[PDB]
UniProtKB/Swiss-Prot annotation:
Main location group: cytoplasm
Coiled-coil regions listed in the entry: none
GO annotations of cellular component type: cytoplasm
NCBIfam families: murA, PRK09369.1, PRK12830.1
Single Gene Ontology MF annotation: UDP-N-acetylglucosamine 1-carboxyvinyltransferase activity
Job of this protein: Cell wall formation. Adds enolpyruvyl to UDP-N-acetylglucosamine.
Catalytic activity: phosphoenolpyruvate + UDP-N-acetyl-alpha-D-glucosamine = UDP-N-acetyl-3-O-(1-carboxyvinyl)-alpha-D-glucosamine + phosphate
Annotated protein name in UniProt: UDP-N-acetylglucosamine 1-carboxyvinyltransferase 1
2-(S-cysteinyl)pyruvic acid O-phosphothioketal PTM sites in chain numbering: C117
Family label: Belongs to the EPSP synthase family. MurA subfamily.
Organism, as annotated: Bacillus anthracis
Intracellular or extracellular location(s): Cytoplasm
Enzyme Commission numbers on file: 2.5.1.7
The protein's enzyme class: transferase
């Protein structure tokens, strides 16, 4: 199997350029299905496995998708199909994101219910709650959730029990073509939501409030193809901020958007890390001694759950007790064991992990449990004695393009073998 081999205690110094946001492009590509004429041209699209999966789903739904030089040209002018099979949904959970758009285009959708996940149960209840409110009738059969609307989608007043990113994307996307105005209260405020909103409006929608807890969508007759550029990946940028801080280096993330990284920056500053908001992006200088802080993941603008595992690697080198309490995804600690393989002193209790640094991490053969954990294990290896060997790279490839190459360009002793 293909794996990444990491070593040394080299300081990472240089510049890195983040890719387009994974968590924004996926729902955006899905939203392209709303354009009944003519073509959407998405720019800054990263060559991630998930992008390939979402593109195939779209082709399966009878849409032409051409992906070249970080650009996805989508044509959804012909009538679309309604079924998104289980083979795609098990591979990529985000495939459910096509439900809203399909439901808005044809008045019905049939999506395979998601399978067990390592990150933790991420149900779609909230998505269905939204569609039922807009006049959709939901039933389940043969592993699929069927949704069909009587007449057409109605704009409705909807309340999310919790600010689900996925639910907000589907409900917001579906509302663009519904009759009347839809009021989505307690919506996801994540930066990716704002970019999806800007995309919907670009196609000809009337979405207001993206970024706030109350999104208002006034439905229109039809949407059109637009030219949109996907925002930088703040999580990828975050991962690099940790690389600098964990090795005590100087990394310039040229295209990082300070505005989408405040929570991360604030926390790293509490640890003694220095962060300069340059003219272009963001520069991160790491200190020789990190201070221990507590992290509590929460819905944006709170600290992002997608940085949880990465921060864990960083805290293991911090002087003092540190804990991360996860309030979004429990159990998102399947990677704890892998850190223990590397001599980490970690304790899992309830929805929190407790670590004491500074540890003396020992390189070992470890396996990526999931996307973000893969980056974390690799990060851990940058400061652990001996050679760290991370397997199950199919997870890394879902959210990071040429990760080992960027780290090598920063001076890391890294390589990708069986390549």
């Amino acid at each position: 199997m293909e794996k990444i081999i990491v070593r040394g205690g080299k300081r990472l110094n240089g510049t890195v350029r983040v890719e387009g946001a994974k968590n924004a492009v996926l729902p955006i590509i899905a939203a392209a299905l709303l354009a009944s004429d003519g073509k959407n041209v998405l720019s800054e699209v990263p060559v991630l496995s998930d992008v390939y999966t979402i593109n195939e789903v779209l082709r399966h739904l009878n849409a032409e998708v051409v992906f070249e030089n970080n650009q996805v040209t989508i044509d959804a002018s012909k009538e679309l199909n309604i079924e998104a099979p289980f083979e795609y949904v098990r591979k990529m959970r985000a495939s459910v994101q096509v439900m809203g758009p399909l439901l808005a285009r044809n008045g019905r959708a049939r999506i395979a219910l998601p399978g067990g996940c390592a990150i933790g149960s991420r149900p779609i209840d909230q998505h269905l709650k939204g569609f039922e409110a807009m006049g959709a009738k939901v039933q389940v059969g043969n592993g699929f959730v069927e949704a069909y609307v009587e007449g057409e989608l109605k704009g409705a007043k909807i309340y999310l029990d919790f600010p689900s990113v996925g639910a907000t994307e589907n409900i917001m996307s579906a509302a663009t073509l519904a009759k009347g105005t839809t009021i989505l209260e307690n919506a996801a405020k994540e930066p990716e939501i704002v970019d999806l909103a800007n995309f919907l409006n670009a196609m000809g929608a009337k979405v207001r409030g993206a970024g706030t807890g109350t999104i208002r969508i006034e439905g229109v007759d039809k949407l059109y193809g637009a030219n949109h550029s996907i925002i930088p990946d703040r999580i990828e940028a975050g991962t690099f901020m940790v690389a600098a801080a964990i090795t005590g280096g100087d990394i310039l993330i040229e295209n990082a958007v300070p505005e989408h990284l405040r929570s991360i920056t604030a926390k790293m500053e509490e640890m003694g890390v220095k962060i300069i908001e340059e003219n272009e992006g963001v520069r991160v200088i790491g200190p020789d001694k990190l201070k221990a802080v507590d992290i509590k993941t929460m819905p944006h603008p709170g600290f992002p759950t997608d940085m949880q595992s990465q921060m864990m690697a960083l805290l293991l080198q911090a002087d003092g007790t540190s804990m991360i309490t996860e309030t979004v995804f429990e159990n998102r600690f399947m990677h704890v064991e892998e850190f223990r393989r590397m001599n980490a002193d970690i304790k899992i209790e309830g929805r929190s992990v407790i670590m004491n640094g500074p540890n003396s991490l020992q390189g070992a053969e470890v396996g990526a449990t999931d996307l973000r954990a893969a980056a974390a294990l690799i990060l851990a290896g940058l400061v652990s004695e001996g050679y760290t060997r991370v397997t199950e790279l199919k997870h890394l490839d879902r959210g990071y393009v040429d990760f080992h190459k960027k780290l090598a360009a920063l001076g890391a002793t890294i390589e990708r073998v069986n390549e």
